[model samples]
Target chain A: SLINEATLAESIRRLRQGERATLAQAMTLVESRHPRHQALSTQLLDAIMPYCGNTLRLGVTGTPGAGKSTFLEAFGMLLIREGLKVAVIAVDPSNDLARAEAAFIRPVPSGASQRARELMLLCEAAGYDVVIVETVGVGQSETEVARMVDCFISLQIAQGIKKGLMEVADLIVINKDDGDNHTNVAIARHMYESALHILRRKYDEWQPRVLTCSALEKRGIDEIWHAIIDFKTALTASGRLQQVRQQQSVEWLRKQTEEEVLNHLFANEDFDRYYRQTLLAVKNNTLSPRTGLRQLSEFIQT
Target chain B: SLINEATLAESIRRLRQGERATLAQAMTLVESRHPRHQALSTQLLDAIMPYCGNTLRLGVTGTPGAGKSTFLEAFGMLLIREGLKVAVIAVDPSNDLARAEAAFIRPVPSGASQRARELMLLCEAAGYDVVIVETVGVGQSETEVARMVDCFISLQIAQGIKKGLMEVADLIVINKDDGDNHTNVAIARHMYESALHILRRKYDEWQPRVLTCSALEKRGIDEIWHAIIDFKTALTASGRLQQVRQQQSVEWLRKQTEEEVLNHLFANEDFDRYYRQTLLAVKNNTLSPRTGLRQLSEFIQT
Candidate 1:
């Protein structure tokens, strides 16, 4: 726990030169763990932190068969062309099956298959100033993933689309605009408008934008890219970008704290002993699930 | 409130004899707000509570311009022909507006001008059992209206359909299958199946039954009606009907209690004094909204 000033300073110095490292390593020097690495990360962040206020974070989602992958590739490439170091982190669930499917659809290039590696290298080597992170297909983990981004693009197929996505999404995209389902595009547009009414109830300044695209044809990709930039521009001009980042950081802190508490409670030996006792009580019909959870939380807190 | 044992017993006696006049009069007595009405309403409910359990409560909803009302009329008439009493309630927010449009569409002496009223008459005339109540349109209030019904039907259009109605809807019907959209019925079917998959997550044992019908052609009305009957039979057989009713009753009670608390807090003299003071503090930026709410709640409680 001792503060090593010299080691911390060196880590910050190296980080300023754009070294890629885990956030844990960066935090260690700031908190006096790995003095050298932590110090360098801190100093680098300190130097650029004020200038880093204009970073654009966006979230994109689509229903199954919406051509989200094609659109993301084209859009991310467009951002890269604009000299933004785009870090595209495609987050699908960490599931093996999903990863396999994503690989087949995207066919990570034979030479550079790993998306993260390519994204990092693109930022370090290419003069692209933005980072694009592509997430795997999300299921129930959308709220968690959304916090990491500044803006969002949700791609939806024409049929079976609803107002729920517009509830959480910022930019709604109707993808797969090819042969027949053109009517579906119109229906989707109407539904998205209806959903925006509900979203407006929650946010006054946040008016979600709706657009249509065929990711496969690479049509509408340019419009979507520029739309994202416009959104980013407006968000910055309105001073909401910084506000959002602060809010996200606070929310992240709360999430981490809860996760830590849950982990500690589950892992604690004394708590484990009480858990078994409570389970036995529940089995005997002496404790209900709600009461048991309360007891567990109380026991762990003490 | 005390129950009028004498009148309630007589109402029950008349109800058992299938004399709906006395029962109807008794129900009026039960729904009254006057002291006498309140007492009699409680008495009538107590007397007829056992009979009420056997009646099927069904809810029907669909997209705008989807011919839900026309379809329901045809469907209800068909059920009536089968010698069954059906109670229908339309819980849509745009029910009043839709009803006016529907009146202009079909001026014939169908069921009811509203779908719910039609169901009640058809079921009552068929003598299958008691055909009770109905409402027009659905919304957050639909959840409230749904509590009175045993089944929930969500209708969508064949071509330009959205997927939201299935969230809380037990039955999903694709309407307007007579036009060019009829050719794409297979696609609608596929989309519905996919939506049902998504719906399955939010509900266990309450899987939405997907069906297709054309109100204009009146082709699939019978089939959709059968699907609804089958769902009711299955729900009853599985005892889910009883469980859901009980759960809905609890929710309704909670909602009523919350509303009553808000009304009482706002109306009470002591609470009003505290609320005014809180407003002044808020104006001066001396008291936070959270603190104001807490103080108001505590003041009202005391």
Candidate 2:
């Protein structure tokens, strides 16, 4: 596994120079599951580590008919007009949010995680000041996004919305507040606020709030932006942001290590053979689970 | 570190001979978290393994307000009257469920999980052919109990019952069907049936059914008994029982191995120090997550 020192340096240099092609190349390299490419990817990630972490990471998620795409489209365009470079790592390629007006909108690979975090960092390194990690209402990824983002904003329509997202959401937006449905969203917004009211506050300085938005009409988009800005400002002012970053970083490291350790511990052929025997023995009630674990540990430590 | 071979022999002998005190001793030994007890616990579990798994393991759970305790009490009493040995490993000590005549009733220690499953085996070895792993309204253990049991029965009252348990429940019991509240229970039974109808079936041959019960009057308890027996008969005849046992056993092994591997991976002083350094490095963005993992793996392999 030879490291291409020169290629990595050039990519990092170009990335910092706002070369979108290099950033995209870096993303592809990172996303690749190739064994040989892994060495280069790690080195590239190590090099860009310092350049990233300079942007606001926002996570957007909602159920299918929750108007996630339209909300992001409307909100992303608003961010663009405010002179901020935006990058959306969307989980769905619905094309409703495709009207990005030259903003970076990349569809995430279906299982967008682990490598997905690196994608946001690469976007930041390339000067996409606001990176939105957009997840489909897929329950697993929806929760995972909150841990990786600075502010998590969930789009909610009136009927089918559930409460799992409410626990982690920094702010909830009731989308489709236009024309005939204007009254509906206002009612929905109050309902969400009350629902969110019962949730235990995760942050001492911040309480999760609900706002109504008409992504179609592009109305109430500015308020969402200001709320996000205020959230960042308040957390940064109290130094909670730094602590949160460290907390997330440590947790990320722990999970990655746990998965690797568990997999590799059974990677050996000799161990896997005995592991099967113990599992069968357990199933047949010939060996207890604790005893099986002990025997396996003894075998490995030998 | 010595295995008390003679003592293990005696315990196993007495346990098979149906000594209740010996069974209680086995439960206490397994429940002890002491390091020295771990060795004996493993050996005791290993020895008793052959005597257990002959019983029908039923897991009962519901919300706090749901009549989980009373349902089990009445149902267990019915089993006892029918000349069957019953054991309830309860999570709560409310005396409402204490009228267990000669049936065994034991309260689970808080966070009753890994050791708790072993407790059931001990009861089984002592001639308790009907073992009920009773869990509190506490959500975490409610789900875990389902995996360990053969027939999962969830009790639902008029209200406060949630859907998490619905997915795993083989039989839904709308408890407290008596006098004026009989109508209420019937109404709730209809509601549960309607809701459960939309759920995708986990078993090809078995469709989970809703039944009414009055734990106070002990009426309908026999029907619940017959339902459980029917579930066992159906699954056992189809050979799904053995397969489910193997599946649960393998899953149990995997989880134990995962937890043990993760903790013991960092047990070494040298690795722990380096682990902390890498964690801090990842947090500060001085090292990428994959690279940190790569370096840590290299260090460990060395």
Best by lDDT: 2
Off by over 4 Å in 2: A1-44, A61-71, A91-102, A107-112, A153-243, B1-22, B25-51, B54-84, B90-101, B105-113, B133-247
> Which lDDT tens digits does candidate 1 get at residues B68-178?
667766766666667654444333353322232111111212212223322332233223342323333434434434555677666655522233444466666777777
TM-scores for chain B, in order?
0.69, 0.82
- TM-score for each of the candidates: 0.48, 0.70
Tell me the tens digit of each residue's lDDT in model 1 across A85-155. 44454554542212321111112222121223223322323222454444433454344446656776677
Runs of candidate 1 exceeding 4 Å displacement: A1-302, B1-5, B31-33, B62-64, B88-134, B138-142, B158-164, B179-181, B184-194, B198-200, B215-218, B233-239, B266-302
Error of 1 at B106 (Å): 19
DockQ of each: 0.03, 0.26
Put down candidate 2 lDDT per residue, A1-302, tens digits, no spaces. 12266666766878887776777777777777897677788788888888888899999887778998778888888888888888888765225345554477766766257767878888988988899988776655557888899998888786223535654778988888877877778877876675455444657778788988788887889999999999998899999997887788788777877766667767878888998898878777788887887888788779
lDDT score for residue A301 of model 1: 42
Lowest lDDT block of 10, candidate 2 chain B: B92-101
Across B153-245, the per-residue lDDT of candidate 2 in tens digits comes to 877677223445555778888877878887788787876675455444556657788999778887888888888888888898889987887
